[model samples]
Target: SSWWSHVEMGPPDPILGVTEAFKRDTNSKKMNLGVGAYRDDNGKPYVLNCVRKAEAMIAAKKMDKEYLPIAGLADFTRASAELALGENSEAFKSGRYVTVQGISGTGSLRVGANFLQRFFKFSRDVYLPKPSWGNHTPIFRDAGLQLQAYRYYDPKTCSLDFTGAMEDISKIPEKSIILLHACAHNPTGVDPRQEQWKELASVVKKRNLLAYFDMAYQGFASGDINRDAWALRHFIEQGIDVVLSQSYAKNMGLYGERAGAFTVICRDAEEAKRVESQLKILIRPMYSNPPMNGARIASLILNTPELRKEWLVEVKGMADRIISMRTQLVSNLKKEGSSHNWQHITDQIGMFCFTGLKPEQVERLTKEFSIYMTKDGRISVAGVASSNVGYLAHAIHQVTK
Candidate 1:
């Protein structure tokens, strides 16, 4: 018998696989709104001008290829933490936070989940929003944690299910771990208001649960990093210790570079030190250390004064593009005379919009129209372009009707 005799074919990824199918279709007008990557008005992948400048600078200097520490680039991690938590953050000032570099958003999340599994003496169950990013469940599950859902999306309104979510999360046992999309929530693109976030903080604090924030979109969501960080910063101000996973992939347009940071806010400087030491122990066996090129390039843009300003502007430009695409999508839908209430198309923010199309509708769009997307109805706004917006909307209208 072959060594792999017992192995069987696995199911395709719900997200990335959609892109593969789209690519194979023969239609010249085929549109791929599956992957959450930015494209220009020409429907081509975009590379930030700032990123190109940073790469040129790095090349001119001809930096060495020395391996980074197990915790990765010190300066990059510090800058990343400051970017997520403001410069005046008490967590940073008091040295109560341990920041480490990781592969990217998903890797950082995995590192945090594994840490919780190894050290946190609490329930092995983790609570996530009902319509969270598809990967969150698998990330926790692979790390040996059971996953459960808390209410999140209100299908009728196509908006946040705040009350039900609060009630469900509040009922979890004390010390249970909960994963929160810090901003620009995945599939649904729904976020709680600032006031609602404050109420949520109160409930979580009262219940004594652990908060794990996944801050992937950051500046890409609102074109303002400060606004995107309101939830996490507010929770910190409420005196709740938390952990965060940060990613520069979306905000910096460094997707292939795999840049990110993972952090834990401890009660005191001493506790932070202890956590840092343990983080090194965990990271060494996993990958030994993170890549150097991406972090160095990211650090150059983040730490250098002029480059940092340029990078911020570049990020804002990408965000504005997404915002523009959203407006265009909604307008085109109405122009096509879509009977369905398409206001949610504009109301939602960030790279994706949950169009509320059923699985059958999605199938029809793919099979009949060559419009590719996940079965769950998420359409990547970044994938839409000036040329395709009208056609995309027409396809959607045809499927919905």
Candidate 2:
């Protein structure tokens, strides 16, 4: 038994693996729609203008490289909570929330999961959507929690299965934790309407279930920060104290910068204070402290009045661009003389869309078309450019026809 003799080969990440395969392809027209990261119309990774401005400001100030606190930068955490809870939130105003900066959405979710594993005490199970993010299962499992899923996406309709979701959620054991995507569900891009969210809040409150929200895309969903946050705020207003994870990856184009926050809403400020203390303790041994540059850029954009406004416009622009790509893809599908309905492409929101392609069709896409995407029929709409939408439509028509 050598030190490394027992090490076993591991499979590539289902999501990231697509990128690896995409990189190996030499086709001039190859499209990488596997990863959920956003791309500009030119099919290039976009960096927002506000971020550039914020970076310039940071550069001019000449900030030190000192380690941040165990929790993270004070300014970033404070601004992050404000972004989620809104300025008018009673919880925020009363200081009844504890927020810690994490590496990004994934890191924030991991921190939340670990905290629950240690202190939740009541249950060791977490309920996720039927087709939640590929990482969701491993994240909770690695954190020592069992993963269960409620019904979510309806494959037949390529939309939400509201009735199935309600039925499943209503029966989850009381006091158990349930994870909810705040908006723009990944892989499927389907989200419940405002009324649907209200109904969910009522049931979760009635059943005494804890809501753990993952808000990976706020303004990036509907092109309005406030509109996208409506569901989370409604839950809090209905007197359900929830734990949430927020990412600035899509909205702020800070994916690599890895800026995000995790928040727990408590009954009162006193409880919040204690929660914060323990969170710091848990985080200290995990990463000691978070990176600074991302937090600094995020804080400046969030805290500065002018930059914040500009960032809003920039995020909305990104959202609108994705929307247009979806529309173009659908329209081009029709132009390809396909009889199948591609309405779901436009109906879905966010960076990725569940295109309803089967594994066989997906394989054909990659082999015959050089269009790389997940086997589960998900494509990153952000990667579809105006120039290539037609080509993508043709590829899909060929495979499905």
Candidate 3:
């Protein structure tokens, strides 16, 4: 009927698609475990107190609708780099890094991928974890980089496959790009130990591979921001220059704000300045400047002393809630007479748990119980509430039994 009739009807997004199904279900007990965003004990979206205050301050200032710089708000970029690289980072102190404000984690990642496709002279192949965020493959591929994978999650034990990962990393051709989840790895909820990260830094340095880190959950991982950022800081200290993407969504409850940053570490300040110019040029045609509200809000929260401390407390609260849900789920499963180990539920960190439930079991959970999650068995533990923990446990036990 229209000129676009030739365009086929596409399927919904794999991860967010679960919400659509959950919405259609009439069951009062329906639960959506596919959400990547955090939820409170009442299963409601929670906004940080710090963010609300920041918005008030910004509103008080009487801002303008004028466009931001091509590189984005200056305060936001500076604060983001310091947050990711730490206050004492040589890269930050000496101005050897360039950070541009991005739409969010997804936007920052795409910008990083696009930058590599244009400026990076090394191999075009980008290595990812065997199972990563659902958007990762399409992001790199659409940017014209060849997508490859190294062993990461081991289904047999539901943990990081360190030995297998190292073997694959060792064989990837030198000068290729390898993406690492700095903490709170998506889907599997697994992260390398500090000791493992030390070894990994040595290998990446020895092999001379370009390291691209995704740090979406900082304080949201272990309720300690500095501890969660240890690996990325360690890599820089070991003389491995890296590109990084940062997100304020989960940690600051800024999901809809679209607040994030993309950074590139260079040889020196001079080199960093040059790189910054090109990044601006690359971003000029693609949406020009970023939104001001998110950048302003993030900047105030990160740069202000009082708000910063409050943000830390709020972030820890969210992390603690997720951890409690994990514990509750495991205890409930045992009470439901589930013979399965269920240890991985607590072992997995951050907001997700890889349930190890087969695809057929996942199908049954969805059809019979109205519980929705990805087909691969990952569940957003943040979506679980104390009131429904028993119900979810009973449903899981029944399907698994």
Candidate with the greatest lDDT versus the true structure: 2
List residue ranges in candidate 1 displaced over 4 A.
none
Q: Model 3 — TM-score against the truth?
A: 0.97
- Pairs of colliding residues, candidate 1: none
lDDT per residue as tens, model 3, 1-401: 59997999888677767888889999998999988788888888897899999999988999889999989999999999988888988878999999999999899999999999999998899999978987899999999999999999989999989999999999999999999999999879988889999999999999999999999999999999899999999999999999999998889888887999999999999999999999999998999999888889999988999999999999999899989989999999999899999998888899988989999999999999999998989999988999989999999999998
- Give the lDDT of residue 280 in candidate 2: 92
lDDT of 3: 0.92
TM for every model, in the order presented, reads 0.97, 0.97, 0.97
- Candidate 1 RMSD to the real structure: 1.4
The 10-residue segment of model 2 with minimum total lDDT is: 10-19
For each candidate, the alpha-carbon lDDT, in order, equals 0.89, 0.93, 0.92
Number of clashing pairs, model 3?
Answer: 0
- Per-residue accuracy of model 2 over 1-401 as CA lDDT, tens digit each: 49999889987577777889899999999999886788888877888999999999999998899999989999999999999999978999999999999999999999999999999999998999989987899899999999888999999999999999999999999999999999999879999998999999999999999999999999999999999999999999999999999998889989888999999999999999999999999998998999988999999999999999999999999899989889898888898899998898888988889999999999999998899998888888888898999999999999999
Residue-level error in angstroms, candidate 3, position 338: 2.3
